[PDB]
Amino acid sequence: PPGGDMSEPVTQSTLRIVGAFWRLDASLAFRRHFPAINWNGSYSLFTSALDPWYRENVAEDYPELRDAISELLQREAGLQEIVQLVGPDALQDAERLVIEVGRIIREDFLQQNAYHEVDAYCSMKKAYGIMKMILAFYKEAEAAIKRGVSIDEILQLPVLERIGRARYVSEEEFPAYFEEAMKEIQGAFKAL
Amino acid sequence: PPGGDMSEPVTQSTLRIVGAFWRLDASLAFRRHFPAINWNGSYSLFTSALDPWYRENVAEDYPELRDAISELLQREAGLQEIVQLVGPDALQDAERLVIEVGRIIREDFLQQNAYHEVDAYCSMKKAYGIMKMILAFYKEAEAAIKRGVSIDEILQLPVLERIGRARYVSEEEFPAYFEEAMKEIQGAFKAL
Amino acid sequence: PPGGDMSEPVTQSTLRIVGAFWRLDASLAFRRHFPAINWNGSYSLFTSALDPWYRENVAEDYPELRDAISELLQREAGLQEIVQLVGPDALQDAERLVIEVGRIIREDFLQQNAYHEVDAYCSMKKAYGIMKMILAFYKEAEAAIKRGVSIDEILQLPVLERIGRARYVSEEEFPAYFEEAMKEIQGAFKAL
Amino acid sequence: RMALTVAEYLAFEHDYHVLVILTDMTNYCEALREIGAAREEIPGRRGYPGYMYTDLATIYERAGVVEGKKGSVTQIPILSMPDDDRTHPIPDLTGYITEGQIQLSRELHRKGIYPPIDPLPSLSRLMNNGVGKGKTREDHKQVSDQLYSAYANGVDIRKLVAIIGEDALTENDRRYLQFADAFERFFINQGQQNRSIEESLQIAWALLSMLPQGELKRISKDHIGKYY
Amino acid sequence: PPIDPLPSLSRLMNNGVGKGKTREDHKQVSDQLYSAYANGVDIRKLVAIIGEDALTENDRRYLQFADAFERFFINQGQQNRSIEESLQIAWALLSMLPQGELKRISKDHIGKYY
Amino acid sequence: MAVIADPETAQGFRLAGLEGYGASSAEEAQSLLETLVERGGYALVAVDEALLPDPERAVERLMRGRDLPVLLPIAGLKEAFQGHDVEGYMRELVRKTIGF
Amino acid sequence: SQVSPTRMNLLQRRGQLRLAQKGVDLLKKKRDALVAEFFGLVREAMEARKALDQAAKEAYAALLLAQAFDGPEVVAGAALGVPPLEGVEAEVENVWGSKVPRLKA
């Protein structure tokens, strides 16, 4: 935008009524996201017509998991606001649940680089994979709290770091890498 | 206006030419009462200059009443907020008495219909009498807590109900209904 | 600025030039402390251009003493913030220290009375002078309160008043009162 | 324009590495404005001309190392733009044009730190693009990526503290803010002090030891020990 | 649909259809669901600060109510519905609220269905 | 523990099962109070209403925060006293919550 | 020095009002709950206090000039002193109105 406004005729008529609309912030991209996107304020109009191929070719839960990841990412926004209003003076088990998860998600899944071929590449299985690791960490966490597992220790499992070293992994190595790592989650959760 | 800004031509131009805003608010409208006039958000610059002629033509103590009685609502507005968070029960009789009188002005006097014929058309000789009685009840109520009287007693007086019956009558019955209603108040704090 | 901001073209142009700047604010000005100057709002490039002719005519310890007042009010900006968010009575001793050094930097040194003529005169001798008054107080109070004293008691001590003599003392009878009181600062506060 | 033609002559055709330094590109813009409206042409860039583009194209696009020449025109624009607006014509077009940028602010100019560079709002687009790799050392490759998110953790929470509490910071966030004040003081005060490629990295890593392993994921196993 | 009922409000709903043309209960059942929903979208940002276990009984029900409202009422995709089947949904959701928390309908309406 | 009370009533809190280090040494028991909470090597410190410190700021500034309580009201004598109901209720309403 | 831009800033500042007003709405009834229940604990507190203060002291004050040489005897048969390092049972509890620790004697 020439004047720095994303509200102007020429953006609306043909740059936001298309298949996908995206956005960038200035300190967003500087951390390590290259390129960066706004998690909320950005939508896709076409998404109800891209569901056939994704169902059949990838899996019949690829359209389900991709809406399911987006839900969590935009639900954290719920709390975000209150943090900047007067803060949490009460940390609970249900508090830091959404919050930390979502953190990991923005840290490893939206920080990608386009200058590196290990931080991104065109491959079904990398997208499929990474998104299943996060599903796992998430899944178990909800049943961690109930039992009496402090969110503080949830940080201090090394498996969060295992998902934090999936964004450097070699493309070819990823299949065998992923399979060995899915087991470590479920072992370092149900045990503790 | 659709919302009105004070830095819109329409608003800052009008504002000056007229002498009155007889503001109704939305909160007040949901409550389904007409007059719904939000007194704190209304003003009329006339009043000053109308006091001479009022008592000339209308009646003796009519201006004396109107300006005096407005204060109830004033000294209630800032009072209710979060200070009386569960009603007054930890509060003094000083502060209790305001909402006892508060009750009759806002459930009887502020309310009126416009789809009942007994009180859609009022006139001066009716309104005046209504208004006098509610002064005279602040005047015997505040005097009650210096005698040692609780609000429990105030909340069982047939006087409160008589104020409600003085608008469930019309201007024709007003004389007879004024006799009985008036003298009832005087003999309903000389019982206490 | 005709509009009341420096965003105006006529005021942005007057800020294309360099050298020295000054900023007069509406808020300081009310208190009848003129000149009104902001340490967060100006810069000069005649600080290091004037440093030769300072340590040649004025005094050697004048390129030094000027720095020694600046630090005071540097820390005052940073801490002013904190003050308005939570009082400094909740904060520790040494926080409140420099705050009330600061008092005298306004009470008797940002008020240069254009109606009193011993403030209407000022020169290097009255400069350098009162700069060593302030200097003393700073270095003593920092050690005083590390012996467990509180800035509360010191406001009642005669030492606070004493530095306040800058507008109760002459211009051309000034070298009589300079040295005099100077001594009592390092004397009669480490006795107390 | 005039100056830059005497750049072309001496870098390219007489093989010398010429540094060109252009300053007061706000006094430029004063003169640009004049022709803007006093001529026939109408304003079209929020009260400045629309042939402005060409006026800032012809200027900046000349510069570049040419392949077959040894010599080069390295241009360093130094702006002076009105206030700290970013909708102002000057930073507008200039941003887009240049690849990799540097900013100065008033955060580090109240502290006495000359230069007062701040890279937190600043941006960079060449630092793993023919640079950070190649005949440019790879030993600051992962360092650049690390310093970013590390410096961020800093600055940002200085703001977040004054809302959440008044001194509220958790075990973790305590560390964040600890690395803010330090890095900035040492590193960004240079001025009459020169630091070579080696001298930089050494010092840098020792402030980075304030964060334990897990925020230092971006630096590799080699890097850590390299500059221990 | 994304339609939120809170910014919304028809200016004409009595000058359109009347009683017996949309069932008589429709009128007051519309100003039930308004106040029941609205209350709950504010305690979703208090679901984990203070929680809902530290909150009143009444307010705890007013949470779950909102959630089931988006799922069943707002959303239905391309499925059809009638006036009568939509008032059906409404009743079920409102049975969860006690008669003590039903005060935005007539005595007639409470005794019409729960 | 320590209970900080009148000399004679301090006496009865030094008995086994309890641990007291009371007695008056001032009108707000500052002489003792301060020194004692400074260490915070007692499980509980309690100051009665027959003394009670008029400047509570004095204590807080010296102990420098405490995760264990201080100045729990005990009556401090017996004379059929039970004015410590309504007194404590108003002690609460004056410094916090609603006014009167 | 630092002045606000118009075109870029506009969209942020319109949603600023959305964010603020709604946030503060519910912030309001967040503490209200907690103070209503607080009255309940302060009142109920003193119930046991009048009852048991006087019946403690009953014997104490009537065993001072018959004690000071039977002090020895009384402390002997009884269960020895409460520990000075955490003789009480301290409980930690996170709650709104910051993390405040409690305890039962």
User: DSSP of C2-70, one letter per residue?
Assistant: -SSSTTSHHHHGGGTS-S------HHHHTTT--S---TTS---SSSSSSHHHIIIII-TTHHHHTHHHH
Measured in angstroms, the CA of G20 and the nearest CA of chain E are apart by: 13
The 10 Å Cβ neighbour count of residue F43 is: 20
Strand extents, DSSP E, B13-157: 20-21, 43-44
Cα separation values, A82 from B136, C54, D133, D176, G32, Å: 50, 54, 43, 21, 17
Cα separation values, B144 from A79, B133, D105, Å: 51, 16, 68
The 10 Å Cβ neighbour count of residue B17 is: 6
With beta carbons under 8 A apart, name residues in chain F contacting B83: 98-99
Residues 6+ away with beta carbon under 8 Å from F34? F58, F59, F62
CA–CA gap between residue B21 and residue C56 (Å, rounded): 72
Are E55 and G96 a contacting pair at CB < 8 A? no
- Are E63 and E43 in contact, with CB atoms under 8 Å apart? yes
Short-list B90, D137, B22, CA closest to F99: B90
Are D162 and C85 a contacting pair at CB < 8 A? yes
Structure tokens at A107: 């840290």
Structure tokens at E79: 């499925």
Q: How many CB pairs under 8 A join A and G?
A: 33
Place of tokens 């006496």: F11
Cα separation values, G30 from A32, E50, E55, G44, G94, Å: 37, 8, 10, 24, 16
As a residue count, chain D comes to 228
Measured in angstroms, the CA of G97 and the nearest CA of chain A are apart by: 6
Structure tokens at D10: 């001496």
Relative orientation angle of helices C178-187 and C124-144, to the nearest 10 degrees: 10
- Are D171 and D179 in contact, with CB atoms under 8 Å apart? no
Short-list E1, E66, E91, E9, CA closest to E83: E91
Give, as one character, the DSSP assignment of residue A185: H
- For the F1-100 domain, the top CATH level (class) is alpha beta
- Are D150 and D208 in contact, with CB atoms under 8 Å apart? yes
CA–CA gap between residue C26 and residue E33 (Å, rounded): 53
- In degrees rounded to 5, what are phi and psi of residue D75? -110, 145
Rg (CA), chain E: 15
Q: Measure CA of the first residue to CA of the last residue in chain G; give whole Å.
A: 60
Question: Three-state SS for D107?
Answer: coil
Short-list C79, C186, A171, C45, CA closest to D114: C45
Short-list D59, D226, D206, D56, CA closest to D141: D226
Give, as one character, the DSSP assignment of residue B106: I
Amino acid occupying residue D48: Y
Structure tokens at C6: 């420096």
Structure tokens at C102: 């600061």
- In degrees rounded to 5, what are phi and psi of residue B77? -45, -60
Residues 6+ away with beta carbon under 8 Å from C32? C111
CA–CA gap between residue A96 and residue A153 (Å, rounded): 12
- The partner residue sitting opposite A78, judged by closest CB among E45, E50, E51, is E45
SS (H, E, C) A72-91: HHHHCHHHHHHHCCCCCCCC
Are E50 and G96 a contacting pair at CB < 8 A? yes
- The partner residue sitting opposite F44, judged by closest CB among G38, G57, G88, is G88
Short-list B74, B10, B66, CA closest to B41: B74
Cα separation values, B127 from A14, B130, B168, Å: 64, 5, 13
Query: Which residue in C has a C-alpha nearest to residue G3's C-alpha?
Result: C7
Give, as one character, the DSSP assignment of residue B44: E
Question: Three-state SS for F43?
Answer: coil
CA–CA gap between residue C88 and residue C83 (Å, rounded): 5
- In degrees rounded to 5, what are phi and psi of residue F3? -120, 135
Asked: is B45-192 a CATH 1.10.1140.10 domain? The reply is: yes
Q: Check CB contact of G32 with chain B, cutoff 8 Å.
A: yes
Paired sense of beta strands D72-78 and D17-23, if any: parallel
Consecutive H or E run containing D20: strand D17-23
Q: By CB neighbour count within 10 A (0-12 exposed, 13-18 middle, 19+ buried), where does F42 fall?
A: buried
Give, as one character, the DSSP assignment of residue B41: G
- Looking at chain E, list the stretches that DSSP marks H as alpha helix, in order from N- to C-terminal side: 26-29, 32-40, 57-68, 83-95, 107-110
Cα separation values, E65 from B38, E71, E93, E101, Å: 33, 10, 7, 13
CA–CA gap between residue A75 and residue A91 (Å, rounded): 17
Place of tokens 């990991």: A104
Structure tokens at D14: 């007489």
- Are A186 and A144 in contact, with CB atoms under 8 Å apart? no
CA–CA gap between residue D75 and residue D58 (Å, rounded): 13
CA–CA gap between residue G10 and residue B119 (Å, rounded): 50
Question: Three-state SS for D116?
Answer: coil
As a residue count, chain E comes to 114
Cα separation values, F87 from A5, A43, F73, F97, Å: 63, 62, 11, 15
- In degrees rounded to 5, what are phi and psi of residue F43? -70, -25
Are G96 and A6 a contacting pair at CB < 8 A? no
- Work out the widest C-alpha separation in chain D, in whole angstroms: 65
Beta bridge partners of A73: none
CA–CA gap between residue A114 and residue E57 (Å, rounded): 53
Q: Check CB contact of A92 with chain E, cutoff 8 Å.
A: yes
The dihedral over CA atoms of F21, F26, F30, F33, expressed in degrees to the nearest 10, equals 10
Consecutive H or E run containing G102: strand G102-104
Short-list B5, A1, A5, CA closest to G5: A5
Cα dihedral across residues C171, C172, C175, C176: positive or negative: negative
Question: Three-state SS for G104?
Answer: strand
CA–CA gap between residue D61 and residue D54 (Å, rounded): 10
Relative orientation angle of helices D171-188 and D197-207, to the nearest 10 degrees: 160
What technique was this entry resolved by? cryo-EM
Measured in angstroms, the CA of D128 and the nearest CA of chain A are apart by: 6
Question: Three-state SS for F15?
Answer: coil
Consecutive H or E run containing D124: none
Ramachandran category for residue B107: left, alpha or beta (phi over 0 → left; psi -120 to 50 → alpha) = alpha
CA–CA gap between residue F69 and residue F43 (Å, rounded): 9
Resolution in A: 8.7
Residues 6+ away with beta carbon under 8 Å from E75? E1
Measured in angstroms, the CA of C91 and the nearest CA of chain D are apart by: 10
Are A27 and D149 a contacting pair at CB < 8 A? no
Structure tokens at D106: 């008033």
CA–CA gap between residue C62 and residue C131 (Å, rounded): 9
Paired sense of beta strands F2-4 and D72-78, if any: unpaired
- Looking at chain D, list the stretches that DSSP marks H as alpha helix, in order from N- to C-terminal side: 28-38, 52-55, 89-97, 141-155, 157-164, 171-188, 197-207, 221-226
Question: Three-state SS for D216?
Answer: coil
Q: Check CB contact of D87 with chain G, cutoff 8 Å.
A: yes
- Are D86 and G8 in contact, with CB atoms under 8 Å apart? yes
The 10 Å Cβ neighbour count of residue D89 is: 23
CA–CA gap between residue B4 and residue B2 (Å, rounded): 6
CA–CA gap between residue B122 and residue B112 (Å, rounded): 10
CA–CA gap between residue D121 and residue G78 (Å, rounded): 71
- Are C162 and C184 in contact, with CB atoms under 8 Å apart? yes
Beta bridge partners of F45: F2
